[PDB]
Amino acid sequence: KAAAIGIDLGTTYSCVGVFQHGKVEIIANDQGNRTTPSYVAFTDTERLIGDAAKNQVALNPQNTVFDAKRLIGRKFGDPVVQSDMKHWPFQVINDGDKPKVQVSYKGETKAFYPEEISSMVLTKMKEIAEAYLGYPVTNAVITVPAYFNDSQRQATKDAGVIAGLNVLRIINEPTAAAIAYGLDRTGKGERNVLIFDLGGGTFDVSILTIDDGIFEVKATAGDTHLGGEDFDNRLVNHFVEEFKRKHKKDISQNKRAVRRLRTACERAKKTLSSSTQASLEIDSLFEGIDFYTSITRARFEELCSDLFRSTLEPVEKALRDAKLDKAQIHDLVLVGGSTRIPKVQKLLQDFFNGRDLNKSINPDEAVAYGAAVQAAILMG
Template sequence: MPAIGIDLGTTNSCVAVFRNGRVEIIANDRGHRITPSFVSFVDNERLVGEAAKLDATENHENTLYQIKRLIGRTYDDPTVQADMKLWGFTVINDDNKPKIPVVHSCGGNIFCPEQISAMVLEEMKNAAEAFLGETVTDAVITVPAYFNDSQRRATHDAGEIAGLNVIGMINEPTAAAVAYGLDREIKNQRDVLIVDLGGGTFDVTIVKIEGRKFYVRATGGDTHLGGEDFDNILVEYFVSEFKQQHGEDISDNKRALNRLRVACEAAKTNLSSSTQAKVRLEALQGGHDFCSSISRSKFENLNHNVFERVLDTVKNTLSDSGLKKENIDDVVLVGGSTRIPKIREMLGKYFDSIKIKRTINPDEAVAYGAAAYAFALGSDEDSALKEFALEDVIPLSIGIGRRGGTMSFAIPRNTKIPTKVCENRLTVVDNQKRVTFKIYEGERTLARDNHFLGKFTLSGIPPAPRRKGKIKVHLEINACGILHASAFEEITGNSSGITIARDKGGLSESEIKRMVQEAEKFRKKDQELKRRSTARNALEDYAYSVKKEVDHKNLTTPKRICIMSSVTEILEWLDINKKEPPEMAELEARKIELEQLVE
């Protein structure tokens, strides 16, 4: 059974497989190699991909996108609060977990981000199965290098809900480096800097490549920086301009905002090849048409701060790696947003002695690397991946809160993974019976300034004077970058621990099981709807073919009238039931009846 690699993107997703000595990018059912990460609920139907994206303007409340910006985050996260204002759908607060209500099958459903991401993953799985002609279960899913532990666990859960066995997770820029290295068969050591700027996330990774061996030196990034931010800035700009033109504020009109967002995305894309782009929308609000334009220079000025953040991240990652820009052999651009001319100009100017590499497809490279890694994790062998080795690092330091509010750095950032560390701790008060350990990630001295991951308590410590009770604390990060923390008291043997994200607001095992069952119901319903749609189309095609050919048959007048009457009745019946295909049994019965009549 082949293992696939899936690039689960904020804006678009892609799937690939390694077979016959090479990676193959898999096209969806429309023949396109990338699929929009959109899910839409229409009447009794669920749409995923391009069909869902096309439905976004009219069905904005039930069309979900950019879900990667929600996954693994809390409702009160400032980035979630900011994004909510610009989305066409609604996000609600469920015990500080962001969830999305939609209307489906004449009823209401509330989904968590993991479930929506699972629907996109399942679409990738289905495309792979159609391409390979066999069932696919094992998969490697990519994540931004700067995803925290909660976001990684949530992505892993989404894969499980989609019916996938997630055999590994790989950082997106690392996957791109694998694609670049394998494509070129680099013989001598080269230090390659990957700039991965996609729809919603930004990563910079420096990788040492030797043949088919990949060693990550350092990584940096921002989980909330990408093409969607350029779109948001354009939306805000044109909202202000519409208000100046017509005196009306459309910021609370979600349908108008959704239409404007689509137009802004198109304008941004046009500015990559043209110096001017127009935005035209009829009856945007209050019957007012909106017509405006924006120049490339104005676009660059509006996004000046974003561009600065991109370059600052590149510089900081270089500093973390211990290398200078002169030590970098290649700079590789990945992600659709690296097509923006200012990004290329800015990086080209900074790395003045290096030609920026654009030789790999920025939309497909991450899935390419994930597929190669998925194959390497399996038991099969191929000469093309002989001696393949991958060594990644953690993006943020992991530490334990100390008394007084400081943080003890247990695992420094850019430590190679998988890794495991053990720290000895002493009790801090006389006769202390329990200790609570708070785990953080970040680089600040004070624990409160870092990202709180979770906590657990070790109880049953034997009474002893302060600093005499001894506890061992273990922190372990697996190859997927998921953290497990535990503590052990030597005398009693008592222990306690957590897998951080699972305890910190993540999905429980029972919730995942329930969502898997719900996904299976959706899957069966979608399959049944597809069968009914196919049967409906077959009946309609047959009715029209009979209508076309009846005059050429040697039939009596009553027979001809009877056949045409039946054809007309069937076509009218299908037209009445065009929103929802009739039941299979009824469709098949009508087709058999017409066939018998024609005989």
């Protein structure tokens, strides 16, 4: 009788849905947010997950973990791990050629596997669903990137099992997004679907063939270090210059200020997807100096124009790989929070010569939406 849930375990944000009453419900967390930061923080006295964790990241950069998805299922000597390490404020150590995140927790040094950190996020998403349903959840579908290997999929599933979940299936994020739009219901005859996924940290282009409910991955492309956080950064640097000009002070080395600016920037950015201007007002940003100011959509676009534009060549590459022309793509699907940006939608639509974009499902929710559907199918 109990519904199974669908979980998007995201690099920067996660999302949970449940199919019931003949429809998918994306479930808001305790703060009312329909997605949750994939953050876990450790303090002298408690463990925080999601919104609570990200909310104190500037205060505790050392023991606030994020990006665990970049580690999960990898060996410590993997060049991706070695490269990514150099830019996290938290320490990563080697335990038998397995990466562990090392932190201080209740005064003692503790280390955690990536799948342990991710299980804490999965636990939160599970608790979010249970608060809405009013009963314990034990079955779930969890998603992963198409490019995940066996080791990565295994560790993701272990994360689920650790969270107390029977993992009915692990499915690809682009397939979940396609399922959400009901594209799996097609009969015999190949349809070509392109998934354009620009999230918080990663950019993924997938071309799938669907034939009588059977998915095949024809081509993948993108950039694992291109995302919304890079748009936040462009804004950070802009406002650091503007604060320097006005107050004649350089805040760029105060890690707490820069982090707090960064957060205000992400909020303003989101607002610029619905508004042509946004107000940025930080109390005591630096040395008790407040920062009240504004930014326009057009200025935001200018600051990011090259990054926005860079998203189209991986589409070209993926089409070439799949041996398809633009015109042979039957459906275009927007995934990831960053595809809410009007300029981004314009770029892709212009690239496809005016074709419709499938964007009626919040793109940062499309993966979980699909997972919830598949979970229900697997339950009966």
